[PDB]
Amino acid sequence: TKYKYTVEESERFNKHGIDLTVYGQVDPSATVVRVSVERGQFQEFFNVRSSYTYYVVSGQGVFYLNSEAVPAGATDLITVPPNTRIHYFGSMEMVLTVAPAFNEQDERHVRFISESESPY
Numbered sequence: 315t316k317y318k319y320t321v322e323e324s325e326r327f328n329k330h331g332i333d334l335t336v337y338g339q340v341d342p343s344a345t346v347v348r349v350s351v352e353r354g355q356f357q358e359f360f361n362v363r364s365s366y367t368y369y370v371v372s373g374q375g376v377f378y379l380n381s382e383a384v385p386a387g388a389t390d391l392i393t394v395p396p397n398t399r400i401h402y403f404g405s406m407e408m409v410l411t412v413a414p415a416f417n418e419q420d421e422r423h424v425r426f427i428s429e430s431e432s433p434y
């Protein structure tokens with residue numbers, strides 16, 4: 315039984331301005347990944363099934379949740395329910411929980427965001 319997953323073993327890639335570490339643990343109830351962001355996620359999406367919960371390890375930023383600004387700093391917990399439009403700006407390290415388990419097909423692209431819109 316493989317309980318532990320390391321960064322060394324993970325899939326690491328850039329998507330829409332963020333750096334993701336996807337450990338590749340399989341569990342139907344939740345997917346937990348690491349997010350590093352220097353300026354922002356320059357894409358707005360919503361997920362029809364899963365809540366996205368961001369724990370801010372370090373840094374600061376601002377989430378836009380159905381266009382509402384939600385400031386965030388280190389140790390804050392940002393919980394986004396399904397069917398909520400999400401993008402964000404900031405310089406942050408985060409732990410993201412997608413529950414139930416992340417499925418890319420549950421995601422709906424709304425728009426791209428201009429890289430100049432980020433004040434970070």
Ligand SMILES: O=c1ccn([C@@H]2O[C@H](CO)[C@@H](O)[C@H]2O)c(=O)[nH]1
Pocket residue numbers: 329330334336345347349355410412416421
């Ligand atoms: O397993 C996961 C979890 C999250 N994300 C992406 O991480 C971002 C979280 O803001 C979104 O673009 C979401 O699609 C993935 O690509 N895979």
